Amino acid sequence: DFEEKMILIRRTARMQAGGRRFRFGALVVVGDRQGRVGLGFGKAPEVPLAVQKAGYYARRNMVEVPLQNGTIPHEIEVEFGASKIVLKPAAPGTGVIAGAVPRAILELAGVTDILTKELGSRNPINIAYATMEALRQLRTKADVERLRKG
RNA sequence: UGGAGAGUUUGAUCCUGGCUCAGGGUGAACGCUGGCGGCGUGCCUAAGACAUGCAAGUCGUGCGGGCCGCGGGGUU
Ligand SMILES: [Mg+2]
Ligand SMILES: [Mg+2]
Ligand SMILES: [Mg+2]
Ligand SMILES: [Mg+2]
């Protein structure tokens, strides 16, 4: 068990003679607040069920966010298709400035002091997906020179 | 020591893309309302037209006299 906050939920739909069937979507984040988080997307015939599946995959796929002072190691940019995200580390006592998507994800990941910018396609879903791969690719002075051994 | 976005093309999706909004600002004006003070600020329009008053003068230690009001006899 971790935190588990719910990003957004939508009602989609398809066609079929007679009318339109349906489906709901659940994009969800999860994190103790120690440097561990997981994003999960859940589709299901009903609101609650979907929100459930959310957390399930959420916990399934999670990442080691190497914090530091409560901020972040280095500044990075990542593009996920059409949606691009900028993560830039702030000094203690700043705030977590971001949209609902990147902020939510960033809170449970721990961070308290981070500068963020949401460029490109601002597709909620895709921003999330983007935010993760960002963290995923975070390095510390350690694992840095850990590769420049030889 | 510094960086948040959202609504809106579709049965739904993703993308592109414009329109729209929340902010801050002003020698402001307009509506409704209106108690006190301090500090600022107040014809952005017709460089249109203007009554009245004032905004530029001063030195008798540069010089000669006019009027007014002071004191003082050279030829008897
Ligand atoms: Mg691209
Ligand atoms: Mg069309
Ligand atoms: Mg419609
Ligand atoms: Mg003028």
What secondary structure letter does DSSP report for A86? E
Pairing of strands A36-37, A63-64: antiparallel
Q: How far is CA A134 from CA A17, A45, A46, A52, A107, in A?
A: 44, 31, 31, 26, 15
Return d(Cα A116, Cα A88) in angstroms, integer.
6
Q: At what angle do helices A100-108 and A124-136 cross, to 10 degrees?
A: 40
Resolution in angstrom units = 3.0
Question: Comparing C-alpha atoms, which of A73, A74, A65 is closest to residue A30?
Answer: A65
Q: Which long-range contacts (CB under 8 A, 24 or more apart) does A42-49 make?
A: A47/A9
Q: Within 7 A of a protein CB, which nucleotides of strand B?
A: 1-6, 11-16
Continuous segment of H or E residues that includes residue A61 = none
Residue A14: burial class (beta carbons within 10 Å; 0-12, 13-18, 19+) = exposed
Q: Which residues of chain A (98-137) touch nucleic strand B at CB < 7 A?
A: 98-103, 115-126
Rg of chain A, C-alpha, whole Å: 17
Structure tokens at A136: 């995923």
Give the pair of three-digit tokens for residue A131. Answer: 């935010």
Spatial separation of the C-alpha atoms in residues A36 and A145, rounded to whole Å: 23
Report the alpha-carbon distance of residue A119 to residue A45 in Å, rounded: 33
Based on the number of CB atoms within 10 Å of its own CB, is A129 exposed (0-12), middle (13-18) or buried (19 or more)? buried
A67 touches strand B (CB under 7 A): no
